[PDB]
């Protein structure tokens, strides 16, 4: 109980579904007193 290398490995194999490997993307959204460089587009209306 001394040391315990923390970087153990998940074993991914189809035999594993609660243990089924899933690829996750996490979005974090924030604004701080600057122009919102992220925007939502608006289409052209015929003039």
């Amino acid at each position, epitope marked *: 109980f001394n040391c315990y*290398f923390p970087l153990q490995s*998940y074993g991914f194999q189809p035999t594993n579904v609660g243990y089924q490997p899933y690829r996750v993307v996490v979005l974090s959204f924030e604004l701080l007193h600057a122009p919102a460089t992220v925007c939502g587009p608006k289409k052209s209306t015929n003039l």
Partner: antibody
Amino acid sequence: VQLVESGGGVVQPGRSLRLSCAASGFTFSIYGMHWVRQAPGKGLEWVAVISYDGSNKYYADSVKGRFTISRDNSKNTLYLQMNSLRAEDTAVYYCAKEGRPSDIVVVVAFDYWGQGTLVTVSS
Amino acid sequence: DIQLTQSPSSLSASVGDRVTITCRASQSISSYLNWYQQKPGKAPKLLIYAASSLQSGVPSRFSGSGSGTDFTLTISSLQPEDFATYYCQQSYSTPRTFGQGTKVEIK
């Protein structure tokens, strides 16, 4: 996971030899790596262990001073430098990895071995 | 250097027989023996780790027990593929060492 060994053969007593163990199929750089020998017809005798980073190095009592284990994490290859070889050092040498079941990470077990290479010390 | 002694060194038994292999450590490691199976000419296979827990892919007939200095490898129903040399191995402290091996032979 593959552990292919090479470098064995016949050597006259007292000279030097280098064993090579190429690893593949797993992340080489974060695992401890072992050598184990088995002379013809006798039991398994532990030889040497090297840390993942090559800093921690331990050897069996009979090989202290003469045998040197090494590591190259770039080519994912394990080595054992043999020096002052003698008759009792004639054996089949295996390279192998620590490995664990993960849930039970209180064992630091053993797992997949190399196929083994024959070292015969005879003039 | 902790010494591991296996008893008996060899034994003869028949298919289906209840097979017992004992491993004794020089000092207590108390849950840290690992058992291996080796056929001649091929690398050993881990059967029991932590002295009481089964490896994945190993049949349930293989069971490990014992604690401290007295440990037991048991095969409930001996099978034709179980005839081999079995080694106990401690991982409590460095350097790592092996028992001499118990050869299971055909009676």
